[PDB]
Design a protein around this ligand. Structure first.
Ligand SMILES: Cc1cc(-c2ccc([N+](=O)[O-])cc2Cl)nc(N)n1
Length: 213
Protein backbone atom coordinates (compact mmCIF):
# COMPACT_ATOMS: atom_id res chain seq x y z
CA UNK A 1 0.00 0.00 0.00
CA UNK A 2 0.79 3.74 -0.06
CA UNK A 3 0.64 3.73 3.78
CA UNK A 4 -0.40 1.41 6.62
CA UNK A 5 -0.66 1.66 10.40
CA UNK A 6 -2.27 0.05 13.41
CA UNK A 7 -5.81 1.35 14.20
CA UNK A 8 -7.44 0.86 17.63
CA UNK A 9 -11.21 0.55 17.93
CA UNK A 10 -12.96 1.55 21.21
CA UNK A 11 -16.60 1.24 22.25
CA UNK A 12 -18.36 4.37 23.57
CA UNK A 13 -19.38 4.38 27.27
CA UNK A 14 -23.17 3.51 27.43
CA UNK A 15 -24.32 7.07 28.45
CA UNK A 16 -22.08 8.69 25.74
CA UNK A 17 -23.50 6.29 23.04
CA UNK A 18 -27.07 7.18 24.24
CA UNK A 19 -26.27 10.95 23.98
CA UNK A 20 -24.83 10.57 20.42
CA UNK A 21 -27.86 8.49 19.27
CA UNK A 22 -30.21 11.24 20.62
CA UNK A 23 -28.18 14.10 18.94
CA UNK A 24 -28.06 12.28 15.53
CA UNK A 25 -31.84 11.69 15.35
CA UNK A 26 -33.56 14.63 17.27
CA UNK A 27 -35.28 17.48 15.32
CA UNK A 28 -33.39 20.18 17.44
CA UNK A 29 -33.99 23.56 15.74
CA UNK A 30 -30.98 25.62 16.99
CA UNK A 31 -28.25 23.43 15.35
CA UNK A 32 -25.90 26.49 14.86
CA UNK A 33 -24.99 26.27 18.62
CA UNK A 34 -22.49 23.43 17.78
CA UNK A 35 -19.89 26.13 16.89
CA UNK A 36 -20.23 27.87 20.29
CA UNK A 37 -19.58 24.51 22.03
CA UNK A 38 -16.39 23.79 20.02
CA UNK A 39 -15.06 27.38 20.37
CA UNK A 40 -15.73 27.14 24.19
CA UNK A 41 -13.65 23.90 24.36
CA UNK A 42 -10.83 25.56 22.31
CA UNK A 43 -10.98 28.61 24.67
CA UNK A 44 -10.64 26.31 27.75
CA UNK A 45 -7.68 24.45 26.08
CA UNK A 46 -6.01 27.84 25.34
CA UNK A 47 -6.57 28.97 29.00
CA UNK A 48 -4.88 25.72 30.19
CA UNK A 49 -1.68 26.10 28.09
CA UNK A 50 -1.59 29.87 28.91
CA UNK A 51 -1.85 29.07 32.64
CA UNK A 52 0.93 26.42 32.44
CA UNK A 53 3.18 28.89 30.54
CA UNK A 54 3.07 31.45 33.46
CA UNK A 55 5.41 29.28 35.59
CA UNK A 56 7.12 27.46 32.63
CA UNK A 57 7.55 29.61 29.45
CA UNK A 58 9.18 26.58 27.67
CA UNK A 59 5.59 25.14 27.34
CA UNK A 60 5.12 27.64 24.43
CA UNK A 61 8.29 26.48 22.57
CA UNK A 62 5.78 24.53 20.41
CA UNK A 63 4.09 27.88 19.52
CA UNK A 64 3.58 31.23 21.30
CA UNK A 65 0.39 32.22 19.39
CA UNK A 66 -2.85 31.39 21.31
CA UNK A 67 -5.70 31.47 18.79
CA UNK A 68 -8.59 29.77 16.99
CA UNK A 69 -8.90 29.21 13.21
CA UNK A 70 -12.16 28.25 11.42
CA UNK A 71 -11.62 26.53 8.06
CA UNK A 72 -14.52 25.74 5.71
CA UNK A 73 -13.68 23.48 2.73
CA UNK A 74 -16.45 23.28 0.12
CA UNK A 75 -14.65 20.52 -1.89
CA UNK A 76 -14.37 18.05 1.07
CA UNK A 77 -17.61 19.44 2.66
CA UNK A 78 -15.76 19.96 5.96
CA UNK A 79 -15.66 22.65 8.65
CA UNK A 80 -12.50 22.53 10.80
CA UNK A 81 -12.04 24.27 14.18
CA UNK A 82 -8.30 24.55 15.02
CA UNK A 83 -6.80 25.80 18.26
CA UNK A 84 -3.23 26.09 19.59
CA UNK A 85 -4.40 25.02 23.06
CA UNK A 86 -2.90 22.43 25.45
CA UNK A 87 -3.87 19.48 23.18
CA UNK A 88 -4.34 15.89 24.33
CA UNK A 89 -2.09 12.94 25.19
CA UNK A 90 -3.23 9.49 23.92
CA UNK A 91 -4.69 8.74 27.43
CA UNK A 92 -6.42 12.23 27.49
CA UNK A 93 -8.03 11.48 24.06
CA UNK A 94 -9.29 7.93 24.97
CA UNK A 95 -10.59 9.19 28.38
CA UNK A 96 -12.22 12.49 27.27
CA UNK A 97 -13.60 11.39 23.87
CA UNK A 98 -15.76 8.37 24.65
CA UNK A 99 -14.69 5.76 27.24
CA UNK A 100 -15.67 7.73 30.45
CA UNK A 101 -19.08 9.17 31.52
CA UNK A 102 -18.94 12.97 31.62
CA UNK A 103 -20.47 15.72 33.78
CA UNK A 104 -23.28 17.59 32.02
CA UNK A 105 -24.31 14.55 29.85
CA UNK A 106 -27.78 14.15 31.53
CA UNK A 107 -28.42 17.96 31.44
CA UNK A 108 -27.44 17.96 27.69
CA UNK A 109 -29.80 14.98 26.97
CA UNK A 110 -32.74 16.56 28.83
CA UNK A 111 -32.11 20.04 27.25
CA UNK A 112 -32.14 18.49 23.71
CA UNK A 113 -35.47 16.60 24.26
CA UNK A 114 -37.06 19.78 25.80
CA UNK A 115 -35.72 21.90 22.88
CA UNK A 116 -33.87 24.11 25.41
CA UNK A 117 -30.66 26.05 24.65
CA UNK A 118 -27.88 23.46 25.38
CA UNK A 119 -25.49 26.49 25.64
CA UNK A 120 -27.27 27.98 28.75
CA UNK A 121 -26.77 24.57 30.55
CA UNK A 122 -23.04 25.12 31.21
CA UNK A 123 -19.44 25.01 29.98
CA UNK A 124 -19.01 21.29 29.53
CA UNK A 125 -16.47 19.50 27.34
CA UNK A 126 -19.31 17.04 26.48
CA UNK A 127 -20.82 19.92 24.40
CA UNK A 128 -18.34 18.55 21.78
CA UNK A 129 -20.97 15.92 20.77
CA UNK A 130 -23.26 18.80 19.56
CA UNK A 131 -20.97 18.55 16.46
CA UNK A 132 -23.16 15.53 15.44
CA UNK A 133 -26.14 17.93 15.09
CA UNK A 134 -24.56 19.08 11.79
CA UNK A 135 -21.92 16.35 11.03
CA UNK A 136 -22.20 12.66 10.11
CA UNK A 137 -18.49 12.11 10.94
CA UNK A 138 -16.03 13.94 13.19
CA UNK A 139 -12.21 13.60 13.11
CA UNK A 140 -10.15 15.01 15.98
CA UNK A 141 -6.40 15.62 15.42
CA UNK A 142 -4.43 16.49 18.54
CA UNK A 143 -0.87 17.26 19.65
CA UNK A 144 0.28 17.67 23.30
CA UNK A 145 3.80 18.74 24.36
CA UNK A 146 6.14 15.75 24.96
CA UNK A 147 3.72 13.39 23.04
CA UNK A 148 2.99 12.26 19.42
CA UNK A 149 0.16 13.56 17.19
CA UNK A 150 -3.01 11.40 17.32
CA UNK A 151 -6.20 11.08 15.24
CA UNK A 152 -9.61 10.17 16.75
CA UNK A 153 -12.59 9.45 14.45
CA UNK A 154 -16.24 8.43 14.77
CA UNK A 155 -19.36 8.30 12.60
CA UNK A 156 -21.16 7.37 15.85
CA UNK A 157 -22.75 3.86 15.63
CA UNK A 158 -21.35 2.92 19.07
CA UNK A 159 -17.58 3.05 18.41
CA UNK A 160 -14.58 5.31 17.62
CA UNK A 161 -11.01 4.77 16.36
CA UNK A 162 -7.59 6.09 17.54
CA UNK A 163 -4.36 5.96 15.50
CA UNK A 164 -1.03 7.86 15.15
CA UNK A 165 -1.72 10.78 12.79
CA UNK A 166 0.30 10.71 9.50
CA UNK A 167 -1.08 14.09 8.33
CA UNK A 168 0.51 17.54 8.51
CA UNK A 169 2.34 18.07 11.83
CA UNK A 170 0.76 20.54 14.27
CA UNK A 171 2.98 22.45 16.67
CA UNK A 172 0.48 21.98 19.53
CA UNK A 173 -3.28 21.97 19.93
CA UNK A 174 -6.42 20.30 18.59
CA UNK A 175 -8.20 20.17 15.18
CA UNK A 176 -11.91 19.23 15.09
CA UNK A 177 -12.89 18.27 11.54
CA UNK A 178 -16.60 18.13 10.84
CA UNK A 179 -17.71 16.16 7.81
CA UNK A 180 -21.04 18.03 7.34
CA UNK A 181 -24.37 16.38 6.54
CA UNK A 182 -25.55 17.06 2.94
CA UNK A 183 -28.39 19.35 4.26
CA UNK A 184 -26.05 21.38 6.59
CA UNK A 185 -23.72 22.97 3.97
CA UNK A 186 -24.76 26.52 5.08
CA UNK A 187 -22.00 26.12 7.78
CA UNK A 188 -19.40 26.24 4.92
CA UNK A 189 -20.58 29.76 4.01
CA UNK A 190 -18.35 32.60 5.22
CA UNK A 191 -21.36 34.94 5.87
CA UNK A 192 -23.06 32.27 8.04
CA UNK A 193 -19.87 31.46 10.04
CA UNK A 194 -19.35 35.22 10.81
CA UNK A 195 -23.02 35.52 11.95
CA UNK A 196 -22.81 32.49 14.33
CA UNK A 197 -19.45 33.67 15.81
CA UNK A 198 -20.88 37.22 16.43
CA UNK A 199 -24.16 35.82 17.89
CA UNK A 200 -22.80 33.14 20.28
CA UNK A 201 -18.96 33.52 20.63
CA UNK A 202 -18.49 37.32 20.54
CA UNK A 203 -16.64 37.53 23.92
CA UNK A 204 -13.90 34.91 23.55
CA UNK A 205 -10.52 36.18 24.85
CA UNK A 206 -8.49 34.73 21.92
CA UNK A 207 -8.42 35.80 18.22
CA UNK A 208 -10.83 33.87 15.92
CA UNK A 209 -9.65 33.87 12.27
CA UNK A 210 -11.67 32.60 9.32
CA UNK A 211 -9.75 31.01 6.40
CA UNK A 212 -11.53 31.88 3.15
CA UNK A 213 -10.82 30.48 -0.34
C1 LIG B 1 -7.60 19.94 24.89
C2 LIG B 1 -8.89 19.92 24.13
C3 LIG B 1 -9.91 19.04 24.45
C4 LIG B 1 -11.11 19.16 23.76
C5 LIG B 1 -12.27 18.27 24.03
C6 LIG B 1 -12.78 18.19 25.32
C7 LIG B 1 -13.85 17.37 25.63
C8 LIG B 1 -14.41 16.60 24.63
N1 LIG B 1 -15.55 15.73 24.96
O1 LIG B 1 -16.01 15.01 24.08
O2 LIG B 1 -15.97 15.73 26.11
C9 LIG B 1 -13.93 16.63 23.33
C10 LIG B 1 -12.87 17.46 23.05
CL1 LIG B 1 -12.22 17.43 21.44
N2 LIG B 1 -11.30 20.09 22.81
C11 LIG B 1 -10.24 20.89 22.53
N3 LIG B 1 -10.40 21.81 21.58
N4 LIG B 1 -9.04 20.84 23.15
Amino acid sequence: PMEEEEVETFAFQAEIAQLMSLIINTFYSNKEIFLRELISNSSDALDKIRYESLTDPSKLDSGKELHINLIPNKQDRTLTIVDTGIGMTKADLINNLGTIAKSGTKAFMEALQAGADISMIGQFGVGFYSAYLVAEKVTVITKHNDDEQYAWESSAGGSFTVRTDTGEPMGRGTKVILHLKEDQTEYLEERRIKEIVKKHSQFIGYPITLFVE
